[PDB]
Amino acid sequence: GLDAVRKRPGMYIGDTDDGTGLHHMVFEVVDNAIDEALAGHCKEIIVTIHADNSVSVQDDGRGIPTGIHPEEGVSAAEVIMTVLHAGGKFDDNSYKVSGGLHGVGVSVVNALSQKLELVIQREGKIHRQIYEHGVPQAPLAVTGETEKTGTMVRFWPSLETFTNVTEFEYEILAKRLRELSFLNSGVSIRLRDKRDGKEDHFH
Amino acid sequence: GLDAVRKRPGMYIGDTDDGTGLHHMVFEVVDNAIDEALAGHCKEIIVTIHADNSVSVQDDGRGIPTGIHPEEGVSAAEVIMTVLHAGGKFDDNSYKVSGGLHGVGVSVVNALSQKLELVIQREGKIHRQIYEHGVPQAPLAVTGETEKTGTMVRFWPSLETFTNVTEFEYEILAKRLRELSFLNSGVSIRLRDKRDGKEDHFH
Ligand SMILES: C#CCOC(=O)NCc1cc(-c2sc(-c3cccnc3)nc2N2CCCCC2)[nH]n1
Ligand SMILES: C#CCOC(=O)NCc1cc(-c2sc(-c3cccnc3)nc2N2CCCCC2)[nH]n1
């Protein structure tokens, strides 16, 4: 399970000491947002490096589905955050539909994050869910009204896991983000660094 | 296990009826070859569409390691062909080293292949291994001498699994291959179609 991930992180996210794994945490989440872009629902992805060296990834896609599978009793949100290798494609009712997994899965990003905050806007509502080291602190909650749809996630990588290189390199993130923007022509991808105020916009 | 894959293929490889999954079989193997390119050992990858609508992917990298883990007793070759989600990075002695999984894993390509033939050239030897529906027909065998190093694999997708679209589209494969070649500047990527003789060379 995720216990196996926390125990041998380099085997799932990549090297936890030279910065490879650390930056892969970002791309793993960005890959998911691109799926929404490819489905033609996401027009913009914004990646922000925060001063405390957490990273947020947000998109204006449909929002990860939050309602439980009417048979299995678990939402797509819960599944992809807490089940190793969970990925692929779901529908609005959290039924799993055909689609390949790709990457390692964001449940790994969650497991190796000291804190991960998930905020999902859909069906008129803001939904919130805090995880710590991959453990949900409460069930996913409705906390307000909204007209927007999309997903926002911020994660703080665990300093129990990542060593030596514990801070994100702008150039590395800007490298991957500039590539993806050229492959998906319609999708705007912004990169913001809140430490010094540098912005990039790949469209 | 791979039994779960054969049972619900669309959940692992993607849609098995509209051709998405079928072409993903190729890219899943090509992604692995690129890892060798990135490590600076592979200078060329060649993808061939065969007349019977099997596809081969070959590279001139180091060759997948074939010797058993001195503790676990299994080679990298065996692991990545027969273990779901097996991927990442190994060393020459089949120890697993830090590295992220990415994609779904080629053991899925194997599971959904009526036949897969693996030929590995390294340490002076040609090594061969036939799989059928993911089952090894014999242990990996040494069948001759060679000075070359590299990996060759040909797979015949299972017509028990893939329906309707059972033949590969050149343009789709050429799409992905042309992209990857531009991202990895030093690596030549060829595409050959043996049905009509069309060739492409992305460098
Ligand atoms: C860290 C972390 C987690 O945050 C994220 O994974 N954020 C990236 C993301 C994922 C999605 C959506 S919206 C959606 C959907 C499907 C059907 C109907 N409506 C919405 N599905 C997804 N994903 C499902 C899992 C595989 C990637 C795509 N939007 N933004
Ligand atoms: C279908 C199918 C299977 O065929 C393939 O996966 N073919 C692609 C491939 C993979 C490799 C090698 S060589 C090597 C290596 C490592 C250390 C020392 N020497 C060689 N490692 C790999 N892979 C290990 C698994 C993840 C992708 C890279 N060469 N060509």
From TrEMBL, chains A, B:
Major site of localization recorded for this protein: cytoplasm
One of the GO BP terms on file: DNA-templated DNA replication
Q: Where in the cell is it found?
A: Cytoplasm
Domain of life of the native organism = Bacteria
Q: GO cellular-component terms in the record?
A: chromosome; cytoplasm
User: Which keywords describe this protein according to UniProt?
Assistant: Antibiotic resistance, ATP-binding, Cytoplasm, DNA-binding, Isomerase, Magnesium, Metal-binding, Nucleotide-binding, Topoisomerase
* Annotated GO MF terms: ATP binding; DNA binding; DNA topoisomerase type II (double strand cut, ATP-hydrolyzing) activity; metal ion binding
Q: Subunit details for this protein?
A: Heterotetramer, composed of two GyrA and two GyrB chains. In the heterotetramer, GyrA contains the active site tyrosine that forms a transient covalent intermediate with DNA, while GyrB binds cofactors and catalyzes ATP hydrolysis.
Q: What else is known?
A: Few gyrases are as efficient as E.coli at forming negative supercoils. Not all organisms have 2 type II topoisomerases; in organisms with a single type II topoisomerase this enzyme also has to decatenate newly replicated chromosomes.
Q: What is this protein for, i.e. what is its function? A: A type II topoisomerase that negatively supercoils closed circular double-stranded (ds) DNA in an ATP-dependent manner to modulate DNA topology and maintain chromosomes in an underwound state. Negative supercoiling favors strand separation, and DNA replication, transcription, recombination and repair, all of which involve strand separation. Also able to catalyze the interconversion of other topological isomers of dsDNA rings, including catenanes and knotted rings. Type II topoisomerases break and join 2 DNA strands simultaneously in an ATP-dependent manner.
> Member of which family?
Belongs to the type II topoisomerase GyrB family.
Record's protein name? DNA gyrase subunit B
Q: What is the lineage of its organism?
A: Bacteria, Pseudomonadati, Pseudomonadota, Gammaproteobacteria, Enterobacterales
